[PDB]
Amino acid sequence: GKPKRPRSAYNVYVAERFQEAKGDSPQEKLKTVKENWKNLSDSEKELYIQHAKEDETRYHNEMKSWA
Amino acid sequence: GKPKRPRSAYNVYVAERFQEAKGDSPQEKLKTVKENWKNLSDSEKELYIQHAKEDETRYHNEMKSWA
Ligand SMILES: [Cl-]
Ligand SMILES: [Cl-]
Ligand SMILES: [Cl-]
Ligand SMILES: [Cl-]
Ligand code: NA
Ligand code: NA
Ligand code: NA
Ligand code: NA
């Protein structure tokens, strides 16, 4: 099957943090994570982005190999 | 506003080629482009992917700068 584009750094962060985020409803948990992404340190941001970049490089290689 | 994730190489190709693709309906034009992406040369594939990678690097920088 066609390789799948990996999740962005911003979406990895929102998803990974959602389950423990709190409080009151899924809407409210999402709202707070989106705030938390905004207030990450530069070095934490940098780490999320580097991990996503690595996954994107793998995806690029897979597209080029894909039959 | 929040930086927008750039379009993937595969989606750039499908979109850019759609208008002149032919023939008979939008569905059929899409179906044919998707076929054409599959049969690109390695070097043409490589070029699309490098252009998308450049846009993704710019997006990474913009996220890291974004206030
Ligand atoms: Cl990203
Ligand atoms: Cl990607
Ligand atoms: Cl891509
Ligand atoms: Cl990206
Ligand atoms: Na830091
Ligand atoms: Na990963
Ligand atoms: Na080639
Ligand atoms: Na571009």
Q: What is the dihedral of CA A45, A51, A54, A56, to 10 degrees?
A: -80
Q: At what angle do helices B42-65 and B9-21 cross, to 10 degrees?
A: 120
- Among residues A51, A65, A67, A64, the alpha carbon closest in space to that of A6 is found at A51
> How many whole angstroms separate alpha carbon A7 and alpha carbon B26?
28
Phi first, then psi, for residue A60 (nearest 5°) are -60, -45
Measured in angstroms, the resolution is: 1.4
The whole-angstrom separation of Cα B31 and Cα B57 is: 30
Domain boundary assignment for chain B: 1-67
Q: Do the Cβ atoms of A53 and B49 come within 8 Å?
A: no
Q: Put residue A4 in one of left, alpha, beta given phi > 0 → left and psi -120 to 50 → alpha.
A: beta
Question: Is domain B1-67 given the CATH code 1.10.30.10 in the classification?
Answer: yes
Query: What is the rounded distance in angstroms from the CA atom of residue B33 to the CA atom of residue B36?
Result: 5
Shortest CB distance from B56 goes to which of A42, A46, A56?
A: A56
Cβ atoms of A59 and A6 within 8 Å: the answer is yes
Q: Which residues contact A40 (CB under 8 A, 6 or more apart)?
A: A13, A48
Other CB atoms within 10 A of residue B45 CB? 20
Strands (E), chain B: none
Tell me the chain A residues in contact with residue B60 when contact means C-beta distances shorter than 8 Å. 9, 49, 53
Q: Please measure the distance between the N-terminal and C-terminal CA atoms of chain B and give it in whole angstroms.
A: 9
Q: Which pair of structure tokens corresponds to residue A10?
A: 């911003």
A63 in contact with B, Cβ within 8 Å: yes
